[PDB]
DNA sequence: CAGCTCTGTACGTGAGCAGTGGA
DNA sequence: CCACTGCTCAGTACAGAGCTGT
Protein backbone atom coordinates (compact mmCIF):
# COMPACT_ATOMS: atom_id res chain seq x y z
CA UNK A 1 0.00 0.00 0.00
CA UNK A 2 1.26 3.33 -1.29
CA UNK A 3 1.77 6.25 1.26
CA UNK A 4 -0.75 8.94 1.23
CA UNK A 5 1.04 12.69 1.03
CA UNK A 6 -1.22 14.99 2.78
CA UNK A 7 -0.56 18.01 4.72
CA UNK A 8 -2.47 21.01 5.56
CA UNK A 9 -2.01 24.71 3.41
CA UNK A 10 -1.76 22.71 -0.16
CA UNK A 11 -2.18 24.16 -3.65
CA UNK A 12 -2.40 21.08 -5.21
CA UNK A 13 -3.51 17.63 -4.58
CA UNK A 14 -2.97 15.04 -7.58
CA UNK A 15 -5.66 12.59 -7.35
CA UNK A 16 -4.90 8.70 -8.46
CA UNK A 17 -7.63 5.75 -9.42
CA UNK A 18 -5.51 4.16 -7.03
CA UNK A 19 -1.88 2.82 -6.52
CA UNK A 20 -0.20 0.12 -9.15
CA UNK A 21 2.28 -2.67 -8.85
CA UNK A 22 5.57 -0.12 -9.70
CA UNK A 23 4.15 2.41 -7.10
CA UNK A 24 3.59 -0.21 -4.13
CA UNK A 25 6.62 -1.35 -4.87
CA UNK A 26 8.71 1.67 -4.60
CA UNK A 27 7.12 3.25 -2.00
CA UNK A 28 6.57 6.80 -4.27
CA UNK A 29 4.07 8.39 -6.40
CA UNK A 30 4.84 7.86 -10.09
CA UNK A 31 7.86 5.68 -11.14
CA UNK A 32 8.67 5.61 -14.43
CA UNK A 33 10.57 7.43 -16.10
CA UNK A 34 8.22 6.45 -18.75
CA UNK A 35 5.09 8.17 -17.06
CA UNK A 36 5.01 11.45 -17.78
CA UNK A 37 4.06 13.33 -14.19
CA UNK A 38 7.60 14.13 -13.39
CA UNK A 39 8.55 15.95 -16.51
CA UNK A 40 5.51 17.71 -16.80
CA UNK A 41 5.90 18.96 -13.46
CA UNK A 42 9.30 20.33 -14.41
CA UNK A 43 8.16 21.60 -17.55
CA UNK A 44 5.29 23.78 -16.63
CA UNK A 45 7.07 25.40 -14.33
CA UNK A 46 5.53 23.54 -11.79
CA UNK A 47 8.92 22.63 -10.36
CA UNK A 48 11.94 24.95 -10.61
CA UNK A 49 14.46 21.74 -11.55
CA UNK A 50 13.28 18.00 -12.76
CA UNK A 51 12.73 15.84 -9.71
CA UNK A 52 11.47 12.22 -9.79
CA UNK A 53 9.79 10.17 -7.88
CA UNK A 54 11.88 9.38 -4.78
CA UNK A 55 11.56 13.81 -3.98
CA UNK A 56 7.59 12.76 -3.97
CA UNK A 57 8.08 13.90 -0.21
CA UNK A 58 9.25 17.34 -0.69
CA UNK A 59 6.35 18.16 -2.94
CA UNK A 60 3.99 19.83 0.18
CA UNK A 61 6.44 21.77 1.96
CA UNK A 62 8.54 23.13 -1.44
CA UNK A 63 5.83 23.28 -3.75
CA UNK A 64 2.38 23.05 -2.28
CA UNK A 65 1.27 19.48 -3.51
CA UNK A 66 0.57 16.25 -2.64
CA UNK A 67 -0.82 12.99 -3.87
CA UNK A 68 -3.40 10.19 -3.02
CA UNK A 69 -6.38 8.41 -4.58
CA UNK A 70 -9.43 6.94 -4.89
CA UNK A 71 -8.56 3.47 -3.62
CA UNK A 72 -6.04 2.56 -2.15
CA UNK A 73 -5.62 -1.21 -2.88
CA UNK A 74 -2.98 -1.88 -4.88
CA UNK A 75 -3.57 -3.59 -7.87
CA UNK A 76 -2.28 -3.54 -11.68
CA UNK A 77 -5.07 -1.58 -13.08
CA UNK A 78 -8.06 -0.12 -12.74
CA UNK A 79 -9.64 -3.08 -14.64
CA UNK A 80 -9.04 -5.12 -11.07
CA UNK A 81 -11.17 -2.81 -8.91
CA UNK A 82 -14.97 -3.11 -8.04
CA UNK A 83 -17.85 -0.65 -8.70
CA UNK A 84 -18.50 -1.16 -4.86
CA UNK A 85 -14.36 -0.63 -4.00
CA UNK A 86 -15.09 2.63 -5.42
CA UNK A 87 -17.69 3.70 -3.89
CA UNK A 88 -16.20 3.46 0.08
CA UNK A 89 -13.22 5.12 -2.20
CA UNK A 90 -14.28 8.43 -3.22
CA UNK A 91 -16.36 8.32 0.48
CA UNK A 92 -13.55 8.20 2.04
CA UNK A 93 -11.69 10.72 -0.70
CA UNK A 94 -14.20 13.62 -0.09
CA UNK A 95 -13.59 12.97 3.60
CA UNK A 96 -9.70 13.60 3.12
CA UNK A 97 -10.38 16.54 0.76
CA UNK A 98 -12.75 18.19 3.62
CA UNK A 99 -9.90 17.29 6.21
CA UNK A 100 -7.21 18.81 4.47
CA UNK A 101 -8.76 21.43 2.02
CA UNK A 102 -6.36 21.98 -0.71
CA UNK A 103 -7.04 24.66 -3.08
CA UNK A 104 -7.35 22.34 -6.25
CA UNK A 105 -8.09 18.34 -6.47
CA UNK A 106 -6.41 17.43 -9.62
CA UNK A 107 -7.97 14.10 -11.01
CA UNK A 108 -5.94 12.14 -12.86
CA UNK A 109 -6.98 11.36 -16.43
CA UNK A 110 -10.88 11.88 -17.52
CA UNK A 111 -11.75 8.17 -15.98
CA UNK A 112 -11.28 8.75 -12.54
CA UNK A 113 -13.41 12.10 -12.25
CA UNK A 114 -16.08 10.36 -14.69
CA UNK A 115 -16.64 8.02 -11.89
CA UNK A 116 -16.22 10.67 -9.07
CA UNK A 117 -18.74 12.68 -10.54
CA UNK A 118 -21.58 10.18 -11.11
CA UNK A 119 -21.21 9.15 -7.45
CA UNK A 120 -20.31 12.21 -5.33
CA UNK A 121 -22.22 14.93 -7.87
CA UNK A 122 -25.01 11.64 -8.98
CA UNK A 123 -24.11 12.84 -12.40
CA UNK A 124 -22.70 11.47 -15.62
CA UNK A 125 -20.80 14.48 -16.76
CA UNK A 126 -21.89 13.91 -20.48
CA UNK A 127 -18.89 15.15 -23.11
CA UNK A 128 -16.38 16.48 -20.32
CA UNK A 129 -13.68 18.57 -20.83
CA UNK A 130 -9.78 18.90 -19.16
CA UNK A 131 -9.41 21.60 -16.44
CA UNK A 132 -11.46 23.23 -14.43
CA UNK A 133 -14.90 21.79 -13.70
CA UNK A 134 -18.27 23.61 -12.73
CA UNK A 135 -18.75 21.83 -8.93
CA UNK A 136 -16.40 22.50 -5.83
CA UNK A 137 -15.82 20.15 -3.12
CA UNK A 138 -19.17 19.44 -1.25
CA UNK A 139 -18.47 21.10 1.75
CA UNK A 140 -15.46 22.83 0.84
CA UNK A 141 -13.88 25.65 -1.69
CA UNK A 142 -11.47 23.05 -3.25
CA UNK A 143 -11.88 22.97 -6.92
CA UNK A 144 -11.65 19.86 -8.80
CA UNK A 145 -9.62 20.03 -11.92
CA UNK A 146 -9.20 17.48 -14.68
CA UNK A 147 -5.74 16.30 -16.09
CA UNK A 148 -4.74 14.34 -19.00
CA UNK A 149 -3.78 10.72 -17.66
CA UNK A 150 0.03 11.24 -16.48
CA UNK A 151 0.07 7.71 -17.61
CA UNK A 152 1.99 7.18 -21.26
CA UNK A 153 -0.71 3.94 -21.64
CA UNK A 154 -2.78 6.42 -23.39
CA UNK A 155 -3.58 7.98 -27.32
CA UNK A 156 -2.31 11.57 -27.34
CA UNK A 157 -0.40 13.34 -25.40
CA UNK A 158 0.84 10.74 -23.97
CA UNK A 159 4.34 12.22 -24.55
CA UNK A 160 5.02 14.22 -21.42
CA UNK A 161 5.54 17.92 -23.31
CA UNK A 162 1.68 18.22 -24.92
CA UNK A 163 -0.13 17.52 -21.54
CA UNK A 164 1.97 20.67 -20.43
CA UNK A 165 -0.38 22.37 -21.54
CA UNK A 166 -2.85 21.83 -18.71
CA UNK A 167 0.10 21.84 -15.97
CA UNK A 168 0.77 25.35 -17.35
CA UNK A 169 -2.88 26.15 -16.89
CA UNK A 170 -3.20 24.56 -13.59
CA UNK A 171 0.16 26.34 -12.29
CA UNK A 172 -1.62 29.57 -13.68
CA UNK A 173 -5.32 28.40 -11.48
CA UNK A 174 -3.25 28.25 -8.73
CA UNK A 175 -1.81 31.28 -9.44
CA UNK A 176 -4.74 33.54 -9.75
CA UNK A 177 -6.61 31.63 -6.31
CA UNK A 178 -3.61 32.94 -4.63
CA UNK A 179 -3.96 36.75 -5.62
CA UNK A 180 -7.75 36.67 -4.80
CA UNK A 181 -6.62 37.05 -0.81
CA UNK A 182 -4.62 40.34 -1.69
CA UNK B 1 5.81 -14.57 -2.20
CA UNK B 2 5.56 -16.58 -5.17
CA UNK B 3 5.55 -20.32 -3.99
CA UNK B 4 7.85 -23.58 -5.77
CA UNK B 5 5.90 -26.09 -7.13
CA UNK B 6 8.05 -29.32 -6.77
CA UNK B 7 7.59 -32.97 -6.03
CA UNK B 8 9.92 -35.85 -6.59
CA UNK B 9 10.47 -37.35 -9.81
CA UNK B 10 9.85 -34.25 -12.13
CA UNK B 11 11.10 -34.77 -15.43
CA UNK B 12 11.19 -31.18 -15.94
CA UNK B 13 11.74 -27.70 -13.46
CA UNK B 14 11.42 -24.46 -15.14
CA UNK B 15 13.96 -21.88 -13.28
CA UNK B 16 13.06 -18.24 -13.30
CA UNK B 17 15.64 -15.41 -12.07
CA UNK B 18 13.02 -14.72 -9.65
CA UNK B 19 9.63 -13.50 -9.17
CA UNK B 20 8.44 -10.43 -11.00
CA UNK B 21 5.79 -7.79 -9.77
CA UNK B 22 3.12 -9.51 -11.84
CA UNK B 23 3.76 -12.66 -10.12
CA UNK B 24 4.31 -11.57 -6.73
CA UNK B 25 0.97 -9.55 -7.26
CA UNK B 26 -0.98 -12.98 -8.15
CA UNK B 27 0.83 -15.93 -6.27
CA UNK B 28 1.48 -17.69 -9.75
CA UNK B 29 4.18 -18.48 -12.05
CA UNK B 30 4.72 -16.50 -15.55
CA UNK B 31 1.36 -14.69 -15.76
CA UNK B 32 2.59 -12.10 -17.97
CA UNK B 33 1.55 -11.74 -21.20
CA UNK B 34 4.36 -11.30 -22.40
CA UNK B 35 5.63 -13.82 -21.02
CA UNK B 36 5.41 -16.90 -24.04
CA UNK B 37 5.88 -19.29 -21.58
CA UNK B 38 2.48 -20.51 -21.06
CA UNK B 39 2.09 -20.15 -24.97
CA UNK B 40 5.77 -22.06 -26.05
CA UNK B 41 4.65 -25.12 -23.81
CA UNK B 42 1.60 -25.49 -25.51
CA UNK B 43 3.05 -24.62 -28.99
CA UNK B 44 6.36 -26.50 -28.24
CA UNK B 45 3.58 -29.98 -27.55
CA UNK B 46 4.43 -29.73 -23.64
CA UNK B 47 1.15 -29.56 -22.87
CA UNK B 48 -2.08 -30.81 -24.99
CA UNK B 49 -4.13 -27.66 -24.35
CA UNK B 50 -3.13 -24.07 -23.85
CA UNK B 51 -3.07 -22.87 -20.07
CA UNK B 52 -1.76 -20.42 -17.77
CA UNK B 53 -0.29 -19.17 -14.87
CA UNK B 54 -3.26 -20.59 -12.53
CA UNK B 55 -2.76 -24.17 -13.52
CA UNK B 56 1.13 -23.71 -12.51
CA UNK B 57 0.22 -26.21 -9.53
CA UNK B 58 -0.84 -28.83 -11.87
CA UNK B 59 2.07 -28.90 -13.87
CA UNK B 60 3.75 -31.67 -11.29
CA UNK B 61 1.30 -34.53 -11.42
CA UNK B 62 0.09 -33.73 -15.17
CA UNK B 63 3.00 -33.10 -17.38
CA UNK B 64 5.54 -33.35 -14.06
CA UNK B 65 6.76 -30.13 -14.03
CA UNK B 66 7.69 -28.33 -11.57
CA UNK B 67 8.47 -24.63 -10.83
CA UNK B 68 11.45 -22.25 -8.73
CA UNK B 69 13.51 -19.34 -9.37
CA UNK B 70 16.69 -18.74 -8.44
CA UNK B 71 16.71 -15.54 -6.45
CA UNK B 72 13.06 -15.20 -4.19
CA UNK B 73 12.82 -11.36 -3.68
CA UNK B 74 10.53 -9.53 -5.91
CA UNK B 75 11.78 -7.21 -8.10
CA UNK B 76 10.15 -5.36 -11.31
CA UNK B 77 12.42 -7.56 -12.63
CA UNK B 78 15.21 -8.10 -12.91
CA UNK B 79 18.63 -5.54 -13.63
CA UNK B 80 18.25 -4.94 -9.84
CA UNK B 81 18.85 -8.45 -8.26
CA UNK B 82 22.04 -7.54 -6.05
CA UNK B 83 25.32 -8.95 -7.18
CA UNK B 84 25.42 -11.13 -3.83
CA UNK B 85 21.74 -11.96 -4.11
CA UNK B 86 22.46 -14.00 -6.95
CA UNK B 87 25.25 -16.11 -5.69
CA UNK B 88 23.59 -17.06 -2.17
CA UNK B 89 20.16 -17.73 -4.44
CA UNK B 90 22.18 -20.65 -6.34
CA UNK B 91 23.50 -22.08 -3.38
CA UNK B 92 19.95 -22.80 -2.33
CA UNK B 93 18.83 -23.64 -5.73
CA UNK B 94 21.44 -26.18 -5.86
CA UNK B 95 19.99 -27.78 -2.70
CA UNK B 96 16.57 -28.09 -3.70
CA UNK B 97 17.56 -29.79 -7.25
CA UNK B 98 19.72 -32.43 -5.02
CA UNK B 99 16.60 -32.41 -3.01
CA UNK B 100 14.33 -33.01 -5.30
CA UNK B 101 16.03 -34.52 -8.28
CA UNK B 102 14.44 -33.73 -11.76
CA UNK B 103 14.89 -35.16 -14.69
CA UNK B 104 16.13 -31.75 -15.69
CA UNK B 105 16.60 -28.22 -14.58
CA UNK B 106 15.70 -25.93 -16.98
CA UNK B 107 17.32 -22.21 -16.47
CA UNK B 108 15.06 -19.80 -17.77
CA UNK B 109 17.30 -17.04 -19.50
CA UNK B 110 20.83 -16.95 -19.69
CA UNK B 111 22.01 -14.66 -17.23
CA UNK B 112 20.99 -17.03 -14.45
CA UNK B 113 23.07 -20.37 -15.98
CA UNK B 114 25.16 -17.71 -16.76
CA UNK B 115 25.63 -16.95 -13.08
CA UNK B 116 24.81 -20.37 -11.67
CA UNK B 117 27.38 -21.62 -13.66
CA UNK B 118 29.68 -19.21 -12.85
CA UNK B 119 28.63 -19.89 -9.30
CA UNK B 120 28.30 -23.82 -8.79
CA UNK B 121 30.60 -25.09 -11.23
CA UNK B 122 33.34 -22.66 -11.31
CA UNK B 123 33.25 -21.55 -14.91
CA UNK B 124 32.85 -18.25 -16.30
CA UNK B 125 31.18 -19.88 -20.12
CA UNK B 126 32.57 -18.31 -23.22
CA UNK B 127 29.67 -17.73 -25.95
CA UNK B 128 26.91 -19.84 -23.85
CA UNK B 129 24.46 -21.59 -26.63
CA UNK B 130 21.13 -22.37 -25.60
CA UNK B 131 20.30 -25.85 -25.04
CA UNK B 132 22.07 -29.19 -22.96
CA UNK B 133 25.25 -28.44 -20.58
CA UNK B 134 28.20 -30.14 -20.27
CA UNK B 135 27.75 -30.23 -16.20
CA UNK B 136 25.11 -32.66 -14.21
CA UNK B 137 23.78 -30.99 -11.05
CA UNK B 138 26.47 -31.64 -8.38
CA UNK B 139 25.76 -34.98 -6.84
CA UNK B 140 22.48 -36.05 -8.61
CA UNK B 141 21.66 -37.24 -12.51
CA UNK B 142 20.17 -34.15 -13.13
CA UNK B 143 20.42 -32.37 -16.55
CA UNK B 144 21.00 -28.51 -17.01
CA UNK B 145 19.52 -26.99 -19.84
CA UNK B 146 19.33 -23.60 -20.86
CA UNK B 147 16.72 -21.54 -22.60
CA UNK B 148 16.31 -17.71 -23.73
CA UNK B 149 14.36 -15.97 -21.38
CA UNK B 150 10.39 -16.14 -21.11
CA UNK B 151 10.06 -12.16 -20.31
CA UNK B 152 9.32 -10.54 -23.45
CA UNK B 153 11.83 -7.67 -22.12
CA UNK B 154 13.96 -9.00 -24.89
CA UNK B 155 14.27 -8.31 -27.80
CA UNK B 156 16.49 -10.51 -29.89
CA UNK B 157 13.87 -13.07 -29.36
CA UNK B 158 11.29 -10.47 -30.67
CA UNK B 159 7.92 -13.26 -30.62
CA UNK B 160 7.00 -16.43 -28.13
CA UNK B 161 7.75 -18.40 -31.76
CA UNK B 162 11.38 -17.32 -31.76
CA UNK B 163 11.26 -19.35 -28.54
CA UNK B 164 9.31 -22.67 -28.92
CA UNK B 165 12.69 -24.04 -30.59
CA UNK B 166 13.81 -24.93 -27.17
CA UNK B 167 10.72 -26.41 -26.18
CA UNK B 168 10.62 -28.50 -28.65
CA UNK B 169 14.47 -29.73 -27.53
CA UNK B 170 13.45 -29.61 -24.32
CA UNK B 171 10.54 -32.39 -25.16
CA UNK B 172 13.32 -34.50 -26.58
CA UNK B 173 16.05 -34.30 -24.33
CA UNK B 174 13.07 -35.54 -22.03
CA UNK B 175 11.63 -38.04 -24.55
CA UNK B 176 14.92 -39.53 -24.87
CA UNK B 177 15.97 -39.73 -21.06
CA UNK B 178 12.99 -41.22 -20.77
CA UNK B 179 14.29 -44.73 -21.76
CA UNK B 180 16.97 -45.31 -21.17
CA UNK B 181 14.20 -46.07 -18.97
CA UNK B 182 14.04 -49.52 -21.34
C1' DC C 1 45.57 -5.45 -31.30
C1' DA C 2 42.49 -10.52 -30.30
C1' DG C 3 41.05 -12.18 -25.78
C1' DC C 4 39.26 -10.98 -21.39
C1' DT C 5 36.12 -8.42 -18.49
C1' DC C 6 34.05 -4.72 -17.09
C1' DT C 7 29.69 -1.52 -17.78
C1' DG C 8 26.58 0.91 -21.09
C1' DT C 9 23.01 0.92 -24.02
C1' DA C 10 19.90 -0.11 -28.08
C1' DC C 11 17.39 -3.22 -29.17
C1' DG C 12 12.29 -6.39 -31.82
C1' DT C 13 7.45 -7.35 -30.30
C1' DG C 14 2.04 -7.91 -27.82
C1' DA C 15 -0.91 -6.62 -24.29
C1' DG C 16 -2.98 -3.01 -21.87
C1' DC C 17 -4.45 1.39 -21.84
C1' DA C 18 -6.44 6.65 -22.13
C1' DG C 19 -8.35 9.04 -25.22
C1' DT C 20 -11.17 10.01 -29.54
C1' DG C 21 -14.37 8.90 -32.75
C1' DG C 22 -15.44 5.30 -35.30
C1' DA C 23 -20.09 1.45 -35.68
C1' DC D 1 -19.09 1.93 -28.72
C1' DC D 2 -15.34 -1.58 -30.79
C1' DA D 3 -11.62 0.07 -33.07
C1' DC D 4 -8.07 2.39 -33.73
C1' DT D 5 -3.87 5.32 -32.52
C1' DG D 6 1.09 6.19 -29.60
C1' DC D 7 3.12 4.64 -26.32
C1' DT D 8 4.18 2.60 -21.70
C1' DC D 9 6.36 -1.82 -19.99
C1' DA D 10 7.90 -6.76 -19.67
C1' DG D 11 16.82 -10.25 -20.91
C1' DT D 12 20.50 -10.13 -23.80
C1' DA D 13 24.01 -9.13 -27.64
C1' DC D 14 27.14 -6.11 -29.40
C1' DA D 15 30.38 -1.31 -28.66
C1' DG D 16 33.92 0.30 -26.63
C1' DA D 17 37.41 1.32 -22.97
C1' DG D 18 40.98 -0.39 -20.89
C1' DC D 19 44.59 -4.43 -19.18
C1' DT D 20 47.21 -8.82 -20.75
C1' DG D 21 51.22 -11.30 -24.45
C1' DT D 22 51.69 -12.99 -30.00
Known sequence: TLPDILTFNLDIVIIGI????????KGHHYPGPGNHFWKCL???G????????????TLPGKYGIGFTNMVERTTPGSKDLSSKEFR????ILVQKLQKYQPRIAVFNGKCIYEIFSKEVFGVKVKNLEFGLQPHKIP???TLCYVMPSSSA?????????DKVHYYIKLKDLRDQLKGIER
Not at 18 to 25: D, F, I, T, W
Not at 88 to 91: A, M, P, S, V
Not at 153 to 161: G, T
Open 153 to 161: RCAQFPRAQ
Open 46 to 57: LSEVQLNHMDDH
Open 18 to 25: NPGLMAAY
Open 139 to 141: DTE
Open 42 to 44: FMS
Open 88 to 91: EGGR
